[PDB]
Each structure stands twice: as structure tokens, then as C-alpha cells.
Design an enzyme around this catalytic site. Structure first.
Site, mmCIF file in Angstrom:
data_model
loop_
_atom_site.group_PDB
_atom_site.id
_atom_site.type_symbol
_atom_site.label_atom_id
_atom_site.label_comp_id
_atom_site.label_asym_id
_atom_site.label_seq_id
_atom_site.Cartn_x
_atom_site.Cartn_y
_atom_site.Cartn_z
ATOM 1 N N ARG A 111 0.834 -1.189 0.000
ATOM 2 C CA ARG A 111 0.000 0.000 0.000
ATOM 3 C C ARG A 111 0.877 1.250 0.000
ATOM 4 O O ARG A 111 1.585 1.521 0.972
ATOM 5 C CB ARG A 111 -0.914 -0.039 1.227
ATOM 6 C CG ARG A 111 -2.110 0.885 1.163
ATOM 7 C CD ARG A 111 -3.169 0.466 2.170
ATOM 8 N NE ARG A 111 -4.078 1.564 2.484
ATOM 9 C CZ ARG A 111 -3.872 2.483 3.426
ATOM 10 N NH1 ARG A 111 -2.779 2.461 4.185
ATOM 11 N NH2 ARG A 111 -4.772 3.440 3.615
ATOM 12 N N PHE A 164 1.475 10.745 1.301
ATOM 13 C CA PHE A 164 1.077 10.204 2.604
ATOM 14 C C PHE A 164 2.155 9.270 3.162
ATOM 15 O O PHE A 164 2.903 9.661 4.055
ATOM 16 C CB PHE A 164 -0.297 9.519 2.488
ATOM 17 C CG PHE A 164 -0.764 8.813 3.741
ATOM 18 C CD1 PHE A 164 -0.434 9.276 5.009
ATOM 19 C CD2 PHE A 164 -1.582 7.694 3.639
ATOM 20 C CE1 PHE A 164 -0.881 8.615 6.143
ATOM 21 C CE2 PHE A 164 -2.032 7.031 4.770
ATOM 22 C CZ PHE A 164 -1.680 7.496 6.023
ATOM 23 N N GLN A 168 3.511 1.720 2.949
ATOM 24 C CA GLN A 168 3.204 0.713 3.971
ATOM 25 C C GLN A 168 3.683 -0.664 3.533
ATOM 26 O O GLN A 168 3.404 -1.096 2.411
ATOM 27 C CB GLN A 168 1.694 0.657 4.219
ATOM 28 C CG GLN A 168 1.252 -0.397 5.226
ATOM 29 C CD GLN A 168 -0.244 -0.386 5.472
ATOM 30 O OE1 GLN A 168 -0.969 0.451 4.931
ATOM 31 N NE2 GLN A 168 -0.712 -1.310 6.306
ATOM 32 N N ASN A 179 -1.197 -0.744 12.554
ATOM 33 C CA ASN A 179 -1.885 -1.576 13.542
ATOM 34 C C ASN A 179 -3.364 -1.745 13.222
ATOM 35 O O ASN A 179 -3.853 -1.220 12.222
ATOM 36 C CB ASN A 179 -1.678 -1.008 14.958
ATOM 37 C CG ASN A 179 -2.273 0.378 15.137
ATOM 38 O OD1 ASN A 179 -3.402 0.644 14.718
ATOM 39 N ND2 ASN A 179 -1.516 1.272 15.773
ATOM 40 N N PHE A 199 4.969 1.778 8.418
ATOM 41 C CA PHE A 199 4.934 2.715 7.306
ATOM 42 C C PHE A 199 6.040 3.762 7.362
ATOM 43 O O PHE A 199 6.527 4.119 8.433
ATOM 44 C CB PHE A 199 3.555 3.375 7.155
ATOM 45 C CG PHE A 199 3.084 4.151 8.361
ATOM 46 C CD1 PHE A 199 2.581 3.496 9.481
ATOM 47 C CD2 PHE A 199 3.072 5.544 8.348
ATOM 48 C CE1 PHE A 199 2.113 4.209 10.574
ATOM 49 C CE2 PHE A 199 2.607 6.260 9.442
ATOM 50 C CZ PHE A 199 2.123 5.593 10.554
ATOM 51 N N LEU A 238 -2.196 10.908 12.967
ATOM 52 C CA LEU A 238 -1.933 9.569 13.500
ATOM 53 C C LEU A 238 -1.242 9.591 14.869
ATOM 54 O O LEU A 238 -1.021 8.537 15.465
ATOM 55 C CB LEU A 238 -1.098 8.762 12.500
ATOM 56 C CG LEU A 238 -1.702 8.626 11.097
ATOM 57 C CD1 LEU A 238 -0.765 7.868 10.167
ATOM 58 C CD2 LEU A 238 -3.064 7.953 11.168
ATOM 59 N N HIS A 292 -0.400 5.499 16.571
ATOM 60 C CA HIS A 292 0.630 4.649 15.980
ATOM 61 C C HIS A 292 1.979 4.979 16.598
ATOM 62 O O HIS A 292 2.321 6.152 16.769
ATOM 63 C CB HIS A 292 0.652 4.846 14.469
ATOM 64 C CG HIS A 292 -0.625 4.438 13.810
ATOM 65 N ND1 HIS A 292 -0.795 3.208 13.212
ATOM 66 C CD2 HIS A 292 -1.814 5.078 13.704
ATOM 67 C CE1 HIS A 292 -2.028 3.115 12.751
ATOM 68 N NE2 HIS A 292 -2.666 4.237 13.031
#
Ligand SMILES: [Cl-]
Ligand SMILES: [Cl-]
EC number: 5.2.1.8
Lengths: 11, 163
Positions: free
Chosen positions: B54, B59, B62, B100, B111, B120, B124
Site C-alpha cells: 500500500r 502520505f 506501507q 496496527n 509505514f 496519527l 501509531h
């Protein structure tokens, strides 16, 4: 949205 | 001493370059050790040959699902594990943080941020940062898309520890 999940990728 | 680890990245098998990370073992030792060991493969399993399943431009990238290869899998060196702390924040590009499925579900997925991801924070665990090869992360980023699917397969052809 912009999330980093393991399982359901959401909005 | 904070360990340094490397990923050698490939695009549909074509070598692209190396990304190295400082792991903040001083602040999050258990989380850093998990990533370090998975990167060396010294426990007998880990990130080598896995993909960034991903990637979303602007952004993050991942990866870390070496059991199911699609984001649905992953396992730590401990057998999941707790959120160690949220001392470090998602401050900008290059931040290394744990993916997670909510509280205390850290496995192997992580990531690499390509922008500040403040939303986030507290959810995270940040445990490292890109040291060298942010240019390579930026190259990887271009193979992503809005929904995360990559146009070419972005793989960790090799990985290990530098220091
Ligand atoms: Cl380059
Ligand atoms: Cl390139």
C-alpha cells in the site's frame, strides 16, 4: 481518509 | 546505541536503491528490536522479499506483511505486542511508524511517511526515521495511487543491519 491499518483499510 | 538498518528496494525486480533507517531504541526499545530483527532475518523470518502493498502519494509507504503479502497478515518476533509509548510524533517525511488494527496490535507492518501525518499521533508508535535514501522513498512513492495499489511491485529485495 489517510489511515495505516492492518485488516480493514478505511476512509 | 541506536541501530541502523537498510532496505534494498526493487521495482518489478529492477534494483532501485537503498533506504536506511535510524531506529530509536533509546525511546522504544521493544518496537525497535522487532523491526531490527525482522530486517536482519536473524530469528529465521522477516522482511526480505516482502512488498510495500500500500503506497499513497503524499502520505506514506506501507509494508511488512511477510505472511499474507497484502496487509491482512504480519507477525512480530514475540509470537502481537503492546503500544510501547507515543513519545515520538509523526512530524514530517521520513518518519518510521507501526501500522496496527487499533490499541496494542503491533505485529510486523510499518509505514514510512512521505509527509507530516499529525492525525496519527497517539495512535501509531513512531520508532525510527529515514537516515539515507529519502530520494529512493520518493521514487517508490510515485508507483503508488490514491487507493494504495501500486502500478509496479515494490519489494524489499534485501534488508539488514549497517550499525
Ligand atoms: Cl534518485
Ligand atoms: Cl528513480
Amino acid at each position: 481518509x489517510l489511515l495505516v491499518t492492518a485488516x480493514l483499510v478505511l476512509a | 546505541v541506536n541501530p541502523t538498518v537498510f532496505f534494498d528496494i526493487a521495482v518489478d525486480g529492477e534494483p532501485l536503491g537503498r533506504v536506511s533507517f535510524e531506529l530509536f531504541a533509546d525511546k522504544v526499545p521493544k518496537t525497535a528490536e522487532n523491526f531490527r530483527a525482522l530486517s536482519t532475518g536473524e530469528k529465521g523470518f522477516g522482511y526480505k522479499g516482502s512488498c510495500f502493498h500500500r503506497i499513497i502519494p503524499g502520505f506514506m509507504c506501507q509494508g511488512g506483511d511477510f505472511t499474507r503479502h497484502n496487509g491482512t497478515g504480519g507477525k512480530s518476533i514475540y509470537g502481537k505486542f503492546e503500544d510501547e509509548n507515543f513519545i515520538l510524533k509523526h512530524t514530517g517525511p521520513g518518519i518510521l511508524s507501526m501500522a496496527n488494527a487499533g490499541p496494542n496490535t503491533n505485529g510486523s507492518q510499518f509505514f514510512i511517511c512521505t509527509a507530516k501525518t499529525e492525525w496519527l499521533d497517539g495512535k501509531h508508535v513512531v520508532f525510527g526515521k529515514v537516515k539515507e535514501g529519502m530520494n529512493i522513498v520518493e521514487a517508490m512513492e510515485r508507483f503508488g495511487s490514491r487507493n494504495g495499489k501500486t502500478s509496479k511491485k515494490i519489494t524489499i529485495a534485501d534488508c539488514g543491519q549497517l550499525e
